[PDB]
Structures are given as C-alpha cells and as structure tokens.
C-alpha cells in the first residue's frame, strides 16, 4: 500500500521561550491545517522524548495537554527513543501502522527546547545521557571526537577536511532565512574557533536550538477519498534501521560498528533504487565526522574518502567565487544541525522538511534544478548508535 506524508507543520527555530508542550501543540495544529484535516481525523500519534522537559509517556502527555482526548474511535499513542534517528524511526513505524491497518492516519511529532533550558542544565542532562561511557565532558562531542581521531589514523582523514563541513553547511544556511547561522564561515574561522574536543571546535558542533515539527502520514487512497502536488505530499518509498553501541570502546574501534551503511543498503533495496536515482540528500550532521561517514555510507563516495569529498566541494566553491552551487553539493541545503539548528532529537525532521521543499520546488534560492524526483533522508542517534534512513519520492 502506498503511504504518503500528507501534512507538515513546524514552529520557528532558536530561543523561543515556550514550553515543549506548547511547541508540540503548535507544530501539530500547523500540520493538520497543511493536511486539510482536523484532530478527529487522526488515528495515531508517535512522539520522541525531550531533554528540556522529560516526561513519562511523552507522547501521551503531549496528546493529553494538547486536548486530543476524549476521542471518537480508536487512537494509538506511542513514544520511541532512538535518539536523533527517532523522527525517521517513527516514520517507519507510521508506515507499518497504516499497512497493517491499525491506523489510517498517523501524526509523528518531535519537540524540544534545549536552547531556552540554559547551558548549565543542557550540559548536565546531555552529559548524564552518557553515564558509564568513560567519556570526558562534554561527553557527546568527545565520543564523536574519538571516532574522528580513529578516521584520521585509519583512513588519513585530515583535520581541515573536518572543518570544511561547517563551512559548506554555513554556505547553505545563508540562503535559508530561518537558519540560526546567518553569515557563512571561512575555514580559518572554524579552525580558530574555540576548541571543544581534541579535533572538534565550537563551530563544528551541533547548534543548540528550540523547535518542533509535526508530520501527518496517511495511505494514499484514504487521503484522496476524504481530504483531497506529488512532491509536496511525497511517497515514503522505504524506511530502514540499524544500530551500534551507545558509546565507543575504551581502546581503539572497527568498521562494522558503523550502521548507516546497513540502513542505507536496506532502504535502497526496499525502494528498488540506487544512489544515482537520488538527487537530494538530507544527512544528519551533528559533527563533521557524522556527515563524512554519511556520504560514504549512502554511496556518494568510497569508504574512507568522505573527507576528500568535502575538500573537492570546498575547493570548487572557492574557484566559483565563493558560491556553493546546490547542484554540485545536493546535501543539507537548509544548513543541517551545524548551521540550521539542532533541538536534540528533532532535527532529522528538518532533513525531511527540506527534502519536501526540494521535491515540491518550494526551496527558493536553495532550489535544485532540475526538480529532484527522489530524496534520501538520514537520522543518527547516540554516538553512531542508531541509523534511520528513508527514501521519499514524488510519484
């Protein structure tokens, strides 16, 4: 059965001074208007946890405070935690609910407020997320830093190639007014920015933000009959997942730890497509090593060569009068976690929303020509611990 994303809604991004409940409720209202639906048309809701306001049975808490109950007929609610892979994991769960006929329509919601919560509270709760890892604080950046160092030793990845990631992302961010990064970085600025971990500087770190996104998923026929273009409500062609350890081993690490390749392969197989058929990529980029690993995993370049992929794109940007042409780097045209923003487990949602914009020819000055017919989105959780990949097609 053909399943589509039929509604998208979201809040702004940044320091919003709103509760997580308020942000979630706003995003969902927006998504329902976008889908030409009302609350009573929803048959399920899936959410992911919040760091700023952790709640027991988060999805149920959101649904209750947002006034979805009482309901006429069946309503299935669930919370899932696969870290930043969560929004795409949930998307796959939504497809499953529709295909098994447990729910004809499904809301998927992610919301957080990790900028408004304050630096002290964020540091405490984000570091506590990695107890027993043995990682120095801040733990998540140090975890990714250890994998980056392994890459440099194993594959010859260069320090400057890591720093090129936020440069490229910032060039994309410039063409998105909502992106938190306003002015593109130079390579020198990134390398001169405050050190956070041995090979990770401040400008290479995911940008704390508040924000929420809601998606509505429905069977194609069901939607056509009741609620009444292809690219603006894309088909979810496939979703696949894979996993790895929550944190790295004390002693350096093996290639089979990385799970994105497995997820990507299975998503391509399920969709009956190859990398050459995909013309937009929304790839999780919490740190440069994540994006470098991602481009390899999805088949944009050979294993161990992701750093060189960045350098060629950087060099071409420099030779093109400092302009990063989207057609030569069809990745994260919104700016990613680096430069658009990162509300904890939310931002894989922005890969989906940017893919939809590209597919529907509504991406503006970021728009790819010709219009992409197919897109791939990738969510990552933990420290390369969860991989979720989906392929979206217009028709």
Ligand X SMILES: CC(=O)CC(=O)SCCNC(=O)CCNC(=O)[C@H](O)C(C)(C)COP(=O)(O)OP(=O)(O)OC[C@H]1O[C@@H](n2cnc3c(N)ncnc32)[C@H](O)[C@@H]1OP(=O)(O)O
Residues at the binding site for malonyl-CoA are 84, 194, 205-208, 284, 382
| HSE-CB for 290 with a 13 A CA cutoff | 32
Binding segment for ligand X (CB under 6 A), chosen from 5-13, 19-27, 89-97, 196-204, is 196-204
Asked if 61 touches a second copy (CB under 8 A), the answer is yes
- If 0-12 CB within 10 Å is exposed, 13-18 middle and 19+ buried, where does residue 193 land? middle
Q: Return contacts of 296-301, CB within 8 angstroms, 24+ apart.
A: 296/261, 297/258, 297/260, 297/261, 297/263, 297/264, 297/378, 297/387, 298/260, 298/264, 298/376, 298/378, 298/389, 299/264, 299/274, 299/275, 300/275, 300/331
- CB closer to ligand X, 182 vs 252: 182
Cβ–Cβ under 8 Å, residues 139 and 127: yes
| Cα gap 277→48, rounded to integer Å | 31
The answer to whether residue 20 forms part of the interface with ligand X (CB under 6 A) is no
The Cα 257–Cα 372 span in angstroms is 32
Counting residues that bind a second copy (by CB under 8 A) gives 55
Residue with structure tokens 């027993």? Answer: 132
Minimum distance from residue 149 beta carbon to a second copy (Å): 18
Rounded distance between C-alpha atoms, residue 138 and residue 120, angstroms: 11
138 binds ligand X per the rule CB under 6 A: yes
Name which position in 6, 157, 331, 342 contacts ligand X (CB under 6 A).
Answer: 342
Rule CB under 8 A: choose which of 152, 187, 196, 257 binds a second copy. Answer: 257
CA dihedral in degrees (313, 317, 319, 323; nearest 10)? Answer: 160
Interaction of residue 82 with a second copy, rule CB under 8 A: yes
Please say which residue, 84 or 326, places its beta carbon nearer to ligand X.
Answer: 84
Which residue from 113, 130, 213, 294 is in contact with a second copy, where contact means CB under 8 A?
A: 130
| Cα–Cα nearest to 370, from 339, 327, 319 | 327
Residue of 151, 258, 314, 344 interacting with ligand X (CB under 6 A): 344
Positions of chain breaks in the chain, given as the residue before each break (C to N > 2.5 Å): 228, 252
Of 135 and 313, nearer to ligand X (C-beta) is 135
Residue 331 DSSP one-character state: B
Contact present, 91 and 108 (Cβ < 8 Å): yes
Question: What are the CA-CA distances from residue 374 to residues 228, 304, 356 (Å)?
Answer: 23, 26, 10
Kindly state the smallest distance separating residue 83's Cβ from ligand X, in Å: 2
The nearest distance, CB 70 to a second copy, in angstroms, is: 5
Residue 243 in the binding site for a second copy (CB under 8 A): yes
Our CB check for a second copy shows the closer of 129 and 312 to be 129
40 binds, among a second copy, ligand X, none (CB under 5 to 8 A by kind): none
- CB of residue 205 to ligand X, shortest distance in Å: 4
83 makes contact with ligand X (CB under 6 A)? yes
Helix (H, G, I), strand (E, B) or coil at 90: helix
Task: Note whether 146 binds a second copy by CB under 8 A.
Answer: no
Give me the least distance between CB of 283 and a second copy, in Å please.
20
x-or-dash string of contact with ligand X, 206-245, rule CB under 6 A: xxx-------------------------------------
In the complex, the smallest distance separating the C-beta of residue 248 from a second copy, rounded to whole angstroms, is 10
Q: Could you tell me whether strands 374-381 and 280-283 are parallel, antiparallel, or unpaired per DSSP bridges?
A: parallel
Examine residue 340 and tell whether it contacts ligand X (CB under 6 A).
Answer: no
Using the contact rule CB under 8 A, the part of the chain among 32-40, 93-101, 277-285, 346-354 near a second copy is 93-101
Complex with a second copy: residue 235 or 331, whichever CB lies closer? 235
According to DSSP, the residues that pair with 106 across neighbouring strands are 217
Contact criterion met (CB below 8 Å) for 74 and 44:
no
Contacts to a second copy by CB under 8 A: 49, 54-61, 63-65, 69-83, 89, 93, 96, 100, 102, 128-132, 240-247, 254, 256-257, 259, 262, 266, 381-382, 385-386
Contacts to ligand X by CB under 6 A: 83-84, 119, 126, 138, 140-141, 196, 202-203, 205-208, 286, 342, 344-345, 380-382
């Amino acid at each position: 059965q053909v399943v589509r994303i039929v509604g998208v809604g979201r809040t702004g991004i940044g320091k919003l001074h709103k509760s997580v409940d308020e942000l979630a409720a706003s995003a969902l209202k927006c998504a329902l208007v976008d889908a030409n639906m009302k609350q009573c048309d929803l048959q399920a809701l899936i959410a992911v946890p919040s760091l700023a306001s952790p709640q027991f049975m988060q999805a149920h808490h959101i649904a209750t405070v947002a006034g979805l109950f009482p309901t006429k007929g069946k309503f299935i609610v669930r919370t899932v935690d696969t870290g930043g892979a969560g929004p795409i994991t949930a998307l796959g769960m939504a497809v499953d609910l529709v295909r098994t006929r447990c729910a004809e329509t499904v809301a998927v919601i992610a919301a957080d407020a990790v900028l408004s919560m304050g630096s002290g509270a964020f540091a405490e709760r984000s570091n506590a997320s990695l107890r027993r890892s043995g990682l120095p604080e801040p733990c998540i950046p140090h975890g990714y830093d250890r994998y980056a160092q392994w890459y440099m030793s194993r594959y010859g990845l260069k320090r400057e190639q890591l720093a090129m990631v936020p440069v490229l992302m910032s060039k994309m961010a410039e063409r998105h007014p909502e992106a938190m990064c306003q002015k593109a970085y130079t390579l020198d600025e990134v390398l001169h920015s405050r050190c956070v971990a041995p090979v990770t500087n401040l400008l290479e770190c995911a940008r704390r933000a508040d924000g929420a996104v809601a998606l509505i998923v429905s069977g194609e026929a069901h939607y056509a009959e009741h609620f009444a273009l292809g690219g603006s409500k894309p088909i979810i062609a496939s979703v696949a997942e894979a996993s790895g350890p929550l944190f790295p081993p004390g002693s350096s690490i093996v290639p089979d730890i990385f799970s994105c390749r497995h997820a990507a392969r299975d998503a391509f197989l399920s969709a009956n497509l190859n990398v050459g058929d995909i013309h937009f990529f929304g790839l999780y980029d919490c740190f440069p090593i994540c994006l470098i690993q991602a481009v390899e995993a999805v088949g944009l370049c050979p294993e161990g060569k992701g750093g060189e992929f960045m350098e060629t794109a950087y060099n071409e940007m420099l030779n093109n009068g400092g302009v990063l042409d989207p057609s030569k780097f069809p990745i994260n045209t919104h700016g990613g976690l680096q430069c658009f923003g990162a509300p904890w487990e939310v931002p894989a949602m922005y890969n989906i929303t940017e893919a939809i914009a590209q597919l529907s020819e509504e991406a503006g000055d970021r728009q790819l020509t010709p219009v992409p017919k197919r897109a791939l989105v990738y969510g990552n959780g933990g420290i390369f611990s969860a991989s979720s990949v989906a392929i979206l097609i217009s028709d």
